[PDB]
Design a protein around this ligand. Structure first.
Ligand SMILES: CC(C)(O)c1cc(F)c2c(c1)C(=O)N(Cc1ccc(Cl)cn1)[C@@]2(OCC1(O)CC1)c1ccc(Cl)cc1
Length: 92
């Protein structure tokens, strides 16, 4: 769609603090597909309520481990490549 399916399928090793984040929402392993990483990040966002009804497409991650990892106070869920780059910054 924005990201190829072959890139979404690929297995990755989170760096230790992304690994902590994913573990906080039930993630049981040391390696994941990008698609699974993004599932748990979706669960983490939705669990911590890092959203606002006024701006329904923006994650509000300031003052959170997520904002520390991603290096931003907020971001758009429409910008997939930018989201992939912020996750690549947190893989071995
Ligand atoms: C409520 C809010 C802020 O509009 C929101 C919140 C939210 F969590 C998501 C999405 C949207 C969304 O579209 N999603 C899928 C997604 C987007 C971009 C990429 Cl590249 C991949 N996956 C997220 O998950 C959906 C879900 O599985 C929890 C149910 C989602 C996942 C991961 C990330 Cl990093 C950012 C966003």
């Amino acid at each position: 769609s924005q990201i190829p399916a072959s890139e979404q399928e690929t297995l990755v090793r989170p760096k230790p603090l992304l690994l902590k984040l994913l573990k906080s929402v039930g993630a049981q392993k040391d390696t994941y597909t990008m698609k699974e990483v993004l599932f748990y990040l979706g669960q983490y966002i939705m669990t911590k309520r890092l959203y606002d009804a006024a701006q329904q497409h923006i994650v509000y991650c300031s003052n959170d481990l997520l904002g520390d990892l991603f290096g931003v106070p907020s971001f758009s869920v429409k910008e997939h490549r930018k989201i992939y780059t912020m996750i690549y910054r947190n893989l071995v």
